[PDB]
Amino acid sequence: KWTYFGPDGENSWSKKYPSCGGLLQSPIDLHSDILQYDASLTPLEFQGYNLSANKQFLLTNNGHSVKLNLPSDMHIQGLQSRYSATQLHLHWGNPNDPHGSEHTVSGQHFAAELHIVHYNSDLYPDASTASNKSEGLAVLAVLIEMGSFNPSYDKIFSHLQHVKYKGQEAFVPGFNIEELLPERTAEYYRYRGSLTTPPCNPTVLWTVFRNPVQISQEQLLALETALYCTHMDDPSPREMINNFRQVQKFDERLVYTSFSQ
Amino acid sequence: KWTYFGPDGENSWSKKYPSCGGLLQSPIDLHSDILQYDASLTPLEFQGYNLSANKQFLLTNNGHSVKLNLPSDMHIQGLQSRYSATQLHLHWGNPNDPHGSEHTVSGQHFAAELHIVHYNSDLYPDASTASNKSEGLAVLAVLIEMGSFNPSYDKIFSHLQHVKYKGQEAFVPGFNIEELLPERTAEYYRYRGSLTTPPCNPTVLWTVFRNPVQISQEQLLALETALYCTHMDDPSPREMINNFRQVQKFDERLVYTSFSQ
Ligand SMILES: NS(=O)(=O)c1ccc(C(=O)Cn2cnc3ccccc32)cc1
Ligand SMILES: NS(=O)(=O)c1ccc(C(=O)Cn2cnc3ccccc32)cc1
Ligand SMILES: [Zn+2]
Ligand SMILES: [Zn+2]
Structure with missing residues (x-):
């Protein structure tokens, strides 16, 4: 199975998963040479993000990240079709880097x-089916840096120790997922990728x-150090660290920005 | 038929070349978190780099770069064996990037x-034989920025229109290779890679x-527009552009520096 380190790492993903060596691959470096303002890029509206605090949502360690399952009444409004949420998850480094x-x-x-992963529910019945299809998926990405303690991110991070090993799970009480979004969500980069x-x-x-x-630093340290890739009884455990892909080439293409200034 | 773009591009190299998906890959991003000063990195000595202008050295387009063969009486001293020169070559982008x-x-x-590629001549007959042996190769890398015209690099670039196509060869009079190196060669980064x-x-x-x-910009433009990956009679020509690999995960390596600040 695939990993981010050793022989089954990212340079080897295209052996079993041929689209990993195809076109339109993400992630990419967003730099000014390739940015272009597009006034078509109006604000998205986040609907159904205030999750019932009387519902619970499944947190899982799937051996590659920590993921929270989201309900399909949560969706983005503002794109040409409605995209409904399926799950959120994170990517991070390690305490030395x-x-x-x-x-x-x-x-x-x-x-x-x-x-925050969404799929086109106007065209397709679930994320699995949409995933290999035209216009199938929409992902929101929030960049994270160290600074203040964030109570909202702690609504997820306080459950990390319950999902330390692969296959483990936890229930998280509903909270307002929009609290995980940054300031001025009108300002974004937009591109088609993978x-x-x-x-x-x-x-x-x-x-x-x-x-x-x-x-905070302590929240970032917990995310980096709480999880393993491996099942609890694996005699050779592997820390879940450095679970991000290297940037891909992105030639003769633009990233569109909703901001010029 | 590996390339830097499309189906046979770098995310697919591991399908035919298993080490491309193995550990210890280059290149890498040199950044503070993984740098450590090592006072034992003393200056290299460049010997036999001043090639006679009355002698001539073979320049070849190998389908992937342009390479100049170097004589085995050219060596680097300072390492724990003598490393002898075998060839130099370049990597570059394209005219619009x-x-x-x-x-x-x-x-x-x-x-x-x-x-500038060297092999351990103390231990091996040639660079081909050295290439699977632990530290069989030492490569020096010089970063090139757009700036002033460089008459020493022009001793190579003035021959580019004679090696435009794969397999073509030209002779370059000897010059002092050390003129291709920067100021303060005693300051370098050292690491184990591939x-x-x-x-x-x-x-x-x-x-x-x-x-x-x-x-200069004009010397970069010549390098970026003169050369083809394909033979002179190929009916699907491919420009030799963007012939650099993306940077690689560190795999727990540090990079040691001969300079402390
Ligand atoms: N990091 S990211 O936001 O780009 C991302 C989001 C979702 C997934 C998967 O669902 C992967 N996945 C897991 N099971 C799948 C079945 C069909 C298709 C995809 C499947 C992979 C990456
Ligand atoms: N860009 S770099 O300086 O890292 C580099 C330098 C040399 C080579 C080769 O010689 C490739 N090559 C070509 N024929 C070979 C036979 C054995 C081993 C390697 C062989 C490839 C890359
Ligand atoms: Zn992701
Ligand atoms: Zn090279």
């Missing part, structure tokens, strides 16, 4: 990155918000 | 990069000089 975003800005990594993990399907409409959020 | 170095520094590409092209053998001691050299 705590710069594990997937997208970079002017060559720089942020500390970590959150992805899933950043196998099968790397080139079917994602990316929205990367312009502004990062902050989490 | 002159940012094609292999190594990056704090996330930023340079315009291009020169590699060849940056197939077969990606993890058998290179890398020395990247701290300081770049400059060549």
Whole structure:
């Protein structure tokens, strides 16, 4: 199975997952040469993000990240079709090199990155089916840097120790997922790309918000150190660290921005 | 038929060249978190680099770069064996994005990069034989930034229109190779890595000089527009552009520096 280190690492994903060596691959470096303002890029509206605190949502360690399952009444409004949420998850580095975003800005990594995965539910019945299809997926990406303690991110991080090993799960009480979004969500980068993990399907409409959020050093350390890739009884455990893909070449293409200034 | 673009591009090299998916890969991003000063990195000595102008050296387009063969009486001293020169070559971007170095520094590409490849002549008959043996190869890397015209690099670039196509060869009068190196060669980064092209053998001691050299926009444009990956009679020509690999995960390596600040 695929990993981010050793012989089954990212340069080897295209053996089993051929789209990982195809076109339109993400993530990419967002730098000024390739940015172009597009006034078509109006604000998205986040509907159904205030999750019932009387519902619970499943947190899982799937051996590659920590993921929270989201309900399909949560969706983005503002794109041509409605895209309904399926799950959120994160990517990060390690305590010796705590710069594990997937997208970079002017060559720089942020500390970590959150992805909120959605699929086109006007065209397709579930995310699985949409994933290899035209217009199938939309991912929101939030860049994370170190700064202030973030109570909202702690609504997820306080459950990490319950999902330390692969296959483990936890229930998280509903909270307002919009609290994980940064300031001025009107300001974003937009490009068509791919899933950043196998099968790397080139079917994602990316929205990367312009502004990062902050989490404290202790929150970033917990994310980096709480999880393993491996099942609890694996005699050779592997820490879940450095779970981000290297940036891909992105030639003769633009990233569109909703901001000029 | 590996390339830098499309189905046979770098995310697919591991399908035919297993070491490209193995550990210890180059190039890498040189950034503070993984740098450590090592006072035992004393200056290299360049001997036999001043090639006679009355002698001539073979320049060849190998389908992937342009290479100049170097004589075995050219060596680097300072390492724990003598390493003898075998060839130099370059990596670059394209006319609309002159940012094609292999190594990056704090996330930023340079315009291009020169590699001067050596093998341990104390231990091996030639560079082919040295290439699977632990530290059988030492490559020096010079970062190239867009700047002033460089008459020494022009001793190579003035021959480019004679090696436009794969397999073509030209003779370059000898000059002093040390003129291709930057200021303050005593300041360098050193690390254990690999060849940056197939077969990606993890058998290179890398020395990247701290300081770049400059060549002009016009010399970059000539390098970026003169050469083809394909033979003169190929009916699907491919321009030799963007012939650099993306940077690689560190795999727990540090990069040692001969300079402390
Ligand atoms: N990091 S990212 O936001 O780009 C991303 C989001 C979702 C996934 C998957 O769902 C992967 N996945 C897991 N099971 C799948 C079945 C079909 C297709 C994809 C499948 C992979 C990466
Ligand atoms: N860009 S770099 O300086 O890292 C580099 C330098 C040398 C080579 C080769 O010689 C490739 N090559 C070509 N034929 C070979 C036979 C054995 C081993 C390697 C062989 C590839 C990359
Ligand atoms: Zn993701
Ligand atoms: Zn090279």
